[model samples]
Target: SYHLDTTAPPPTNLSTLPNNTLFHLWRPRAHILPAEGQIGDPCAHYTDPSTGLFHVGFLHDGDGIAGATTANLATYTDTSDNGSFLIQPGGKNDPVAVFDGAVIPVGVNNTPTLLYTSVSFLPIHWSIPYTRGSETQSLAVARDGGRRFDKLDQGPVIADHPFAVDVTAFRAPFVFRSARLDVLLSLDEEVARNETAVQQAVDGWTEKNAPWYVAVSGGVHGVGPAQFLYRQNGGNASEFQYWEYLGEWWQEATNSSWGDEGTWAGRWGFNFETGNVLFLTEEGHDPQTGEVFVTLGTEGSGLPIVPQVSSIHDMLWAAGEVGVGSEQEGAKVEFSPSMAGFLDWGFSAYAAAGKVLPASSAVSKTSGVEVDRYVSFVWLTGDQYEQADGFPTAQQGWTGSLLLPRELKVQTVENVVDNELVREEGVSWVVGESDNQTATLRTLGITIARETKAALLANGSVTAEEDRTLQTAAVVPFAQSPSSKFFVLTAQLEFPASARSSPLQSGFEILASELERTAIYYQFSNESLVVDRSQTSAAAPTNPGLDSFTESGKLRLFDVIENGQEQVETLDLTVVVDNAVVEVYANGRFALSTWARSWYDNSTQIRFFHNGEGEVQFRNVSVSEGLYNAWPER
Candidate 1:
């Protein structure tokens, strides 16, 4: 069975990304306009500079480009294949109130036209010529002279010959000129697919002929998954290139004896900005189940040397950045830790190419991209294989404390900050007493300097400030009698702000940065059976083993292969949650298990009241609880 957090929400759409850009966030109920003309699918192109807006030419009709609305959906006529536009006696006019109408009308095709319905990529730039060799293709103004028609200059109709495959369907051929002298033609995926089916699609169109980049969205205007021209290599259709695997916006993995959940999908690494290639992807979760998913991946060497790490900040992509239709934010680093980290601390000092500005620095736009409102995070990556201490440092593990690579936050443990051990030091809270459990505390305040040392110990009691005046909150819902088999006794307590100021605030801080971002999860070997409640969600990636992401609400089997035999384990808990994340303590030691969705890349707050009984007393939280301090010791 797969483990997922059903409570998580879907990824936020693009209408947000860059620090100084805007994108559209459309709904079926908004973005609509009435007109004799109709709106078509939205496409991206460099705005005609003079107009100061990305050219949003779509399947339109009527007198001119004046009646379109940047509403939820485009309104069209019956003859329109959902791509149909309205028509009038005068000539092709503006649809209604255009959403992104800065795009100049390049040319229309014999096929039907619509806005935002087509899966198309953008050809950063294009050019219109009258003749190339003996062929002549002319573009003229509409007889009625609409605003859209006025944007273009009349050209000679070279390539005048008609019957070459009819060439009837492709209504909108995106021909743009790049900063380089080459011309690019971005085709709608639907049209590209159609052309492929009919064997009329263009071939041998290299980066020199047509360099294209595209985006895809599931909802909104209903365009298919956006694709680019890398695999085809200018349509030469060469070898596997780099192993391209395609999937929908969402997908899932099923567990089976023969199937491995560790499958990967294709990722993108090329764009128009940075003058070098760019690649970004949201880690794949089971796209079908929409569970807690992560987009863990790598960028290729084809990209420029600037973006060495995450590529998000390595490139200077301001000019000619690609824009996905409304609902898709442009390239960004949206992981939770990254956002929270930025909110907590501003840019890292080492930043060179990419600027890490405050959230207040971003600009809003209606074209459907918002790369501005985001933060960046660099988490404590764990090892894949667990060792005595647990797992390798780089392996992606389930638990650990957030130890910043450097001390960037203003307020932190004095020890960590003074020692200059910021990046790797963090706090992890887990349940359970200490390993040498001579004595343990249950819903009480107790401390163990050594096996025999104790500052103060109490049970079912609460603590106040150093003044020892008034009690904080009552400790309720306390657990004892070993909630799980891993421990003999488990005590729960909560720490209020008053108690924290009294004891915790005055406590000694640990300086180990690598140990900072860790948390605890109770894992023990038992037979009583407990139910596993997490389901496959948009929060965590599916298990790389034989587990289905959709198997939610089932008890964990907790079995592992040892000596070539299957063995199951039991679990109990004594939890200590800290600033970075949550953890579970088992027996007298802390369990190494931890969990975080791609979300929360940043640091989190400690909420002792949120999990267990609070208002408890304690000399210090870093030290383990004592035995005589326990309700019942092992």
Candidate 2:
């Protein structure tokens, strides 16, 4: 009964594509998408412990909560009962805007429970949120096995922004249970509280228990992006309404813990949306001593602010330790940040739904043991593409896509003498200063969800291309057809020892034609993964907003040790170009997901170029097409 939502638009039909103009041909055949419409920030990433089933949700077309399920995190299928959407805008007592929120399995019998942002009224456009009507963290429960969630009768769990300060913006709630959920001194009333109150409730509430903690993403008005924290009072499953407001969870003085070098982990702009925390512990390390990282969409001035604040969004992560704040002056909790960086190199990945994978499915193929890790699905949001004259995706009637689920594995580095000295990883990481006199920093490695890699390999009609060592370049022609647009190319590139000190660039190009091509290369000097789409379009509007932006990801290629000699490593490149959407994962650590607005339609070839560099060897080069469509219903 919870699955059948007849109101959704039908699944996308590839047969209905425009033949002459090649509009829908630009629609990605492999990447995940909702019907034929717009989509945004992901939500409710849940993995059932008992069944090993995975559920991921998203803000669909600005009005509905759309979700899908997958058993292996490989190929996600829409709900059989509900078609596309799990919840829509026009429901009884529901807010006009059903924005982003967290989905938990802490409900009755471990059913689906939603703690989401509800905007009943948009006081000022959707950008501003400092008026009479406030965004509430509302609750809902799916009494039906996995569908049909209804709002709580008692109303919102956290009613609006706390206190009287004008907040920059308020939305997106992240809830988790941790041992550090300390109930502060200020509880009785907002204005009247003193040492007498702490004398009464300090020992009474500071028992040995890991209570539920919820953090909502927003800004501190004058200050930059921050999360508002709250601790859950005792309540039964899916019945908690009361919470202890614990001030702003550690506002910052500056974003430079590891020093700002070429857009490494730093604060976004004035505000943030969809901020969540992830715990990272070292390999063979104690879970309690793990470092926590905050991931969210940053929005603010790019220092100079006039012309530098180009894109309004970019996903970022900051890792640090959590501690109890001094409530003697003012009760609050705190997160002291150590290091931060862009979650995705390019700008598309936003509002990620970070899911803590259950131990059953969290096992890494390399270790064959469950590693403490997390995965996320992000909204590969659109450019201002409609503004461009011939935006094929817009003409095809869809906007944005859900990036292939990514595995976020925490990797540890030992003995960081100076953060500047440890720029090899070029990632956001936490410096572990310990009593054992061991200095270590934990950074993250990103890739397509591991389980899905098997699916991408197994389901494809692979065409083994000739492996060639080249100093200049070579052209790879793929099979041509409307369906031929679906394919994945993966190779182990062994660049010569001199690759680190090359003349300029090395790497490959996708969707290449004489007139148009998208370049995915590695800048040897900068040590970054760069995707240049400036030449992707040959015609149409000259001034493409975000469409032709040159995007670069800070990536230090992993070092390879062989024959007791240490040298540079192979560039493990996995490029997935399914029509308009393209994703590249290098060395299984760097990622850049983006879309190419205009193509020559016959631009179905790849060219690998290593300019002025040593001869690079390409091994295990396989171009596989026909990875089964994510939307089988189509």
Candidate 3:
């Protein structure tokens, strides 16, 4: 039996001041002294009968013992100075306490059995780092309200248990009474076996009566076979086999995957009520002080688990909502949660749009079901551009504003049959005479109302009729061109054989400085509509597949080969420009989304240009404004 040492000062009563509050050891208050030096591993338990208060104990390396008691789990009062805490008098002595640190209550009498490992018993083998100098643990007995331990002179509670084939060391024992039998489990570090296992031995246990559930750790660094949850019905303690490996913990990402370096996890504690397993992770060491700093690592309820998304977004929302680390700590990157939610909802809507609507159907607010395809298009437009805005830090540099599609229209057969087709044929002419101009040849004829188009091209300030139709035939003017960056232009073009060799370009352009502008138009050269940003700015972003400084984007408009039949094809284009990004859709097909930084300048002017000598028809030409509000007020 071990006895207390008398060489050190006797335990004394510690003073308590009224109105004084204590703090948790993990987070010490002004009056509380933080734990210093190499402290022993902690062991904790709730006090008997009341169970309202909890006591935590640990060995102090400086020949001192320390402990704290907590009424509320959040804060704790130091009990070591008050002679209530357990302490060892010498370095080699076994620590003593009034109550068993790890105890499980037995039946009616409230008799309790406690298990603990002692280095004093196995000093020779305790020198290793992994085992913690534990050879054999003994069980102590006590009754209800009896703070004294009585060691039965019989023998060590566990002897020759056939664990750890090389070295006989058993530690961290837990005993619980379940529906079937009394289960005793302990960690056995077998040097001979070169493995660590939770060995189990129970009384009144048969193959069927054996416990059906067992949980294992992910190993020291979450890289061991112990990462499993096992069940066995027909096996003895030795025969019990792991049937299933729990994959939730180490198999998938919680908030994010644990990194390979700069962190270490240990000492896991599980709470059933909250479903949280608390563990310690060494984050990093102080560079100058050489002190190791650790943080709490938890699985489950310990983190904010939102049903809608993962914990990464959960904490990000909280960080922004609660203004975490704002002001003196430093300015944090924050955006309204509603904004993020709006973006998320919009993205989901876009994903649904591909399935709900026709591939070539122009998105508007009204259709067969009275749903605004334009609103759907607007959500997609808003999400596609804003979702790629930037990270939290990068958001700080965002000089852009939110822009939405205000109007979208589809060209029907009626609009195509009624609109005028501009045609320009023949090029050979006499140099001197005005008679060189052929008889009003309108091959791919087109004209522009540059001044009026310019007036209608205001950014963030375009007006539409109050009672606009949800679905309307293309009202685009065949003779007038739209000047706004956000406009719906639909037309059918027939290029004469003579004009086929000439380059034809017509669509939208943002006119910046002289000779500098960006345009998205159909260039008949490749039989594809291209987004050309080559001259949008003197320093435009480079695209790998395209020419230098040129977006060189394209969308095919004249395939004329559906169902293996050759026919004339018309182009229905919807284009939207919000600040730096441009989104275009043709026949409800996603064409391109690119950026031209020069267009974001408020001074830039938007307009349409038809340049080639070709016969092209402008049918059902229309124009409307774009949404400027960042968020809806209501």
Candidate 4:
């Protein structure tokens, strides 16, 4: 009933009052002025060049006002609307307006200036759902305290294009300057006037110029709302060279489709000092769900493959122009001998590093440089040898494991006489025996076969059982009439201490008749094992053009060290006879695989053989019947 605040002191400290206690503050107490409608997008600038007094200007409803000036920009008091320079091309009945205006410092006579766009629609009946497609805009300029403005000579800069012939055009030239005079011209390049398409085109443009930063509409394409594509001069200069179609711009959002709001748009700017392109986009909505998504700011990125000496060395060397020239050179300008040597060294090093293998076995897309390029002593499928440690359990279906060669070393030697001696001796069947020799399997706890010690003691020093110039010995069989196609024989052998340094041969054998059997043995003189299938069949189809007998006919075992000193004792041999395939594992260190033609199927017998004069002992003899079922079951 009574609305006088005489007792309340008229809210002298209104800001310090609480919301519930101050109804007057919430209702809007009169400050210095009043407005009938909304006002926004204010552009303020200093009017006096002599002093720092500024005049504020903004849109009031559909019109504009040039508010009063103040010495300090933060504090201002203004009166009603003075006027607006909006060009109403549609006459008095049209709803013409002014917004997004900027006051500039450089105008005629420093009288101060205002730059803005005046928009109007065509005679087409624009719907409420879409009002701006028929719109036309012109760049207007005002001087002398925002009082009067005239439309530029380029009238209706952004209007619809003619039908069929170059059906698109541009408008709204945002002018600016740095190294050179630049202007942002936006034209609808295609028939569709969609933001996503335009943004995608702009993004593709920036992506094409990947390493060179480009500006769009005066800002760098990814930089801000402008466009500028300039490269640095030779250190310092009056003009900056322009670079394009290679610079990286930040990718804020990527759209899944054409109309998706996630596509990039809005103001962009670039920074040469930091080599960065920046972008600002408004929140976009999902076309299907109409869900809002935030504008993303991302750095414009580079190539998929990392650039390094190794990766590009092949191409660089192939081109051979790494670093030599007058500004437009490859890597280094003005080459010298050392630089050439460095390039050569780099290329050599890269080649020496070897090409990395693919993750799985695959046929090469291209043919090899040579026919023999495929031959290598390497496991083609997997890495690391599977020891007998029982780590990967057996599978249920058909499976196979490869015990292929993974590496060959520097100490391994080939074609020594001792290696050849066993092969030749085994195949020749140079059968002989010492007068008082003996053989036993100590590891198997079985005495193989013993004879009297009457041959020779040689001053109580054991002189090689009275010695024979040449001899071959096949010991007692673990299986008398062995007929199995698959069997494993393991035994330990000991050779005389005096024969450690000299050549000797001893291991296991498969007897299929006296003339047709495979001798799986080892040679101490060369410290290698041999799978001599050479004698198994004298008439097999042997490749005469092969490099060596080991390559063309038999398998050679290498890289084995005898366990004991001098008297090379404790030699272990494991032989697996699986049908036509024969594999040997020596002392658990070296292995070999080769094919043996079993002339007689049911006459297989396990035995031991040696061609050396030195006393040889065999022990721990055992034979098993089948391949260990390493393959998965059907």
Candidate 5:
């Protein structure tokens, strides 16, 4: 029952492995290509250059969950010069914002495996959870949809019998283990409690009417198939083990309905001494009738009191071999983080199940000297299907992954708390209450670095450039270089309101005539001219499409041309003087022109409006002679 690497082919069960030894878990990646004309391609940014050289770039990571995916990217070498890998983990743990699909993880023998459901196909909230010994591991995700790497093939997952639940279904699963069994606890929403209430319980009723279900495998003998077990006490009890047939889970079947396919949900158990145990549900089978009976308890008060939980109403499931099973053999289970004194450890959905301490009787395998590391907690990651109005419902699940943190002795590490906070993935917990600007700042890992308003950048480096970029982009949005390495003019010039003449009289002077089949006007002596400066004028640009300020206050890039449409002119126009970049604005929202060229006329004046009745308004006009090192960092 102890896990030690015997150098076996496929890695051993993670839970059974010793705390110090490392085990590799593999998962197959899957992908859901965007429709031909889909506006944005989610996989655009996942392309990497290194794996192109190797012929086997398709397989990247050495380890994976149940479903396959490439990991540890260092696995593949670039084989192509165009900097492309024909095969990649394109459909695995994609970034939350970038993708629109479900990534669920499936765990058997406590090994992390993922199941990928495209957002277009599955419409329910789904996430994966992993637990080891007593710890919950953090979940890691793949960037691609779920393809390439060492991912699992989309073969027959439920070829035998498929189970689908509606949006209204309530479901929760528990991992059960005993000296002779390994079980899964599940809750079914449609059914009522008690055998008598079954007929009176509404229209949508199923014979296996257990609001809570337990999936037991690795039973007394490890030879058990995956089975669905139900709760009798409306699933509210702290302990119960009673069941009915939900049907068999065969990956090679023709039936779609679980109950109609069979009268009873087959018993899910394990082989003798091969796998783990039989079932971990609160109740065990009755010897008199060979029927499973589970004692469901009310909320808070558990069969065995565990104080903190007593306050809330929760149905509890117990699994350690205490009284129900036979005399126990001394077995050691170990993990590393709980003892480090983490304030948020237990509160997290996937927190470490406290480390296993040396028992009173057993010669502990994990004694004094610590070796490498151990699995501590399991976490759920990625998008869940949401209802149109914003409620969470269950649909098809996703592939979940586990997280294991590197353990360090507290005595040797100073400020270890800070390291833990930053080291943990998906650690940012701050969310703004109002204002898009405020929300943006909250998202960036902004903190008081050296008592300065700075944050760790994507490259793990911080600079004033990032801070300023974030500020302007999120709060005071204005046009700027895409690379954000420079600033552009935001000024405009409008025409005046007084003038009357056929030859067109305005600033300097004016002469109109048919030249080259077009009306031409030259300013020479007309004195009706005006120059106005206003803040609104500076907001104009000839090609505003080339700039952005939306994602301001965050170190990121945004485009002003929404929906790929150019709506503003960012060009600035002005008379040439000595060589200089010309900046011009119009209608208080448009800037045009090129550069200031030298013209040898002491009275060279330009007209804002081409005709006599032209009036102009200008504002917030400021220009520098040279590049100002626009990069805020500089």
Candidate 6:
């Protein structure tokens, strides 16, 4: 064990935080936050071909969608010369407000297009077709390369009670090209179940070959979450509008073979307020050789095993495929799910914005090979910590932050079979690695963006390291200090091939002290990784919630070659802690991100421990401290 090295001076910078002035003291210096007011959903992420600088639009200061530019993920500049706020609220027709939206990199007539959600005028405007408080999909066009926009001459591209069925809430339109996803290719399983029919539907997608498709997020009232599909029209607009309602892309999903995972159906939330689809590919492979992942922001996430003291808005994801003959008009589209899991198994981090980084700029230069990359950002709105010191929050005047930039991709690998499982169609048991001789599956990989990671750990020095059998808690634990608040901990843990004969527990105790601690570790008995935050503070949420709940993340054993023997099963885990944020990634496939706030500056310590009746070996365990902060000299 070792003590934190907080004496080293950090990179000096100006303290006039433009976006995070009020709550800058308690907020994360390594994360994105707003100071003027509160920040919400991140949207309109695109790379400007004209300037070669990346432009990202987000719900800025709770006002309107604002734009910012950044060449590196670490530093940013406001896009506009004066206010920087683009797509203001209250556009032409007295829209109550304009919220989140997607940016079409290339749109009709080769101009940048913005498709945003307009909160229609209410009460008095109820007589209108799709007006009176409905969150409707609307369109706007940017004359040049900047912010000011003019709405379509006709009207809202996707309004006028587009849905035959009723929806409680509808918003967040996401657009993508049909060329990126190939039906048979993404799902390369050798099966006959609706094989030809699926091909025919995919061929329909090719036939339309519309410039791009859109998915609108909503809920079927008391039913469940749903997504509506629409595609850009060909040629000219009968007055700048060219969109065809392709009907509901999909509706609520009911329980199937993967019954244990509630997310397979409706457990996440009643509605997916902000939903999106992503096409991910493996490095050095064509785009077709990838997986299609659906990520969404769920409302009313009544998660089990957690206290109901506070509201829970969660981000969930599923890796599925374009389905069979559901391509016909008036028929809802289909998505054959492969596996489902949480984007970040945390109390915050919602309404994610995912986009493919332009391959031209997102290339993997380190390996001398060019590769495509998909990245995302999320809004952090957990309130327990803010409530932890509830007295000071009113004065602080700020409440949310954006999770650090994340890189996404597909985990397509082959491994030994005896530990894989088998069950039914698209069942986790069947897809789970349990008892197969050799098995292959696809999973979305979440990790710190390359640039962000490099920036955070660039100036770090090794604090402590070891490789040995950790069967008990260490005599001396890692220290609690400012430097320790920001560090990267990595290790390779070896355990029994299967839970049937595994150890009781083994993992790390992070942000800990005598009064509280967050436990991140592997629970062999449950065959999952867990973050136990039950004792994370001196005084828990007064309202009685899951503030003290320990959440579990998906984990599995993988084959590894050790000592020239090909019979070892181990987990490669990485944990990054930035003051109030903690992210854990296991095996490059499974990841868990959470919000963490220590009871006191000196109350948190990092420690490793093992328990129960079996062997657990931890190798290459190291803690890198003194990580540079993400925000500096702005």
What is the lDDT of every predicted structure here?
0.20, 0.63, 0.29, 0.29, 0.19, 0.61
Please list the residue runs of candidate 5 whose C-alpha ends up more than 4 Å from where it truly belongs after superposition: 1-123, 126-149, 159-179, 182-374, 378-634
Candidate 3 lDDT over residue span 1-634, tens digit each: 1222222221121112111111110111111121332233233232333342334343333233244543322234555343333433322223422111244333123444444343333232111223433333444554323333344344433332222322212333322212211122121223212111211232233432333322222222222211122223332322222222212122122222222320111112121000101110111111111111111112222333332221111100000111111223221111111100111111111210000111122211112223211111111221122233221211121112111211222211211111122121111110111222211210110111111123224333433222111111222212333343344333333334344455766555553444457676666675455666667643223212112233333233332333454334556665545434454555532234444544222324555456644545544444455423221111
Which window of 10 residues has the lowest lDDT sum in candidate 3? 313-322
Model 3 residue 571 lDDT score = 61
Candidate 1, residues 1-634, lDDT tens digits: the string is: 2222222342242112232121111001111122222232222222222222211223233222322211111111122223223222121221122211212122233111112111122211111111212212223232222222322232221122222321111122122112111111234424332434323332333333332211111111112111111111242222212211111222111111101211111121221111111121121111111111111111212333333233321111110122112234321111111101111110111110111111122111332323321111122222111111321112221222221111011111111111111121211111123233111211111111111112112222232212111144321212211111111113322234232223221111111111121112111122111112132112223223211111111111122233454332222333322221212332221122123222221212211112221233332222232212110110
Predicted structure 1, TM vs. truth: 0.20
Please list all clashing residue pairs in model 2, or write none if there are none: 3-81, 3-82, 4-81, 265-340, 265-341, 269-299, 269-300, 270-299, 270-300
Which runs of model 3 end up more than 4 angstroms from their true locations? 1-396, 399-494, 497-503, 513-515, 538-548, 552-554, 558-567, 599-603, 606-613
Query: With candidate 1 superimposed using the best TM-score fit, by how many Å does residue 411's alpha carbon deviate from the native?
Result: 28
Between prediction 2 and prediction 4, the one with superior lDDT is: 2
- Per-residue lDDT of 1-634 in model 4, one digit per residue for the tens? 2233422323223223332332221111111111222233233232334333434444343454334443321123443243332222332222354433333333333344333434454332101122343333334455444444444555443333222211111111121121100101122323223445444444334321122112211112221211112221221122212221112111112211111221112111111110111110111111111111111111111235222111211100000110112233121121111100010111111110001111111211121111101101111011011111221112111011112111111111222223322223112011122222212110001110011011111112210112122244445444443455555566776666555555677665674555466666667554556666555642232322110123111222222233421234356665555454454555432345444534344447665667644557766666555433221110
How high is the lDDT of residue 487 in model 6? 78
lDDT of each residue in 1-634, candidate 2, tens digit only: 1221212321233223353233364667656777667778888767655445677788777886777777656666775343377776654335578888787665534566788887776653223446645577777876444545677776677777877857766788877654333333235444223545443554455322445567888766555556788767542223466777777885543222235453576455666678877765544212243456777877644454543233456677777665456545443557876667767766666777787765554233332546545777777876441233334453356677877877775665443343333444434654545333334656765777766676666677767767767765444443331235567888877766677677557677776766767788777677787888887755423433436778887766544344445445567888877666788887654677787754455565677666655567778877887665666656
Candidate 3 is scored at a TM of 0.28
Which runs in model 4 stand beyond 4 Å of their true positions? 1-481, 538-569, 630-633
Candidate 3 local lDDT, residue 234: 32
Give model 2 RMSD, 1 decimal: 7.7
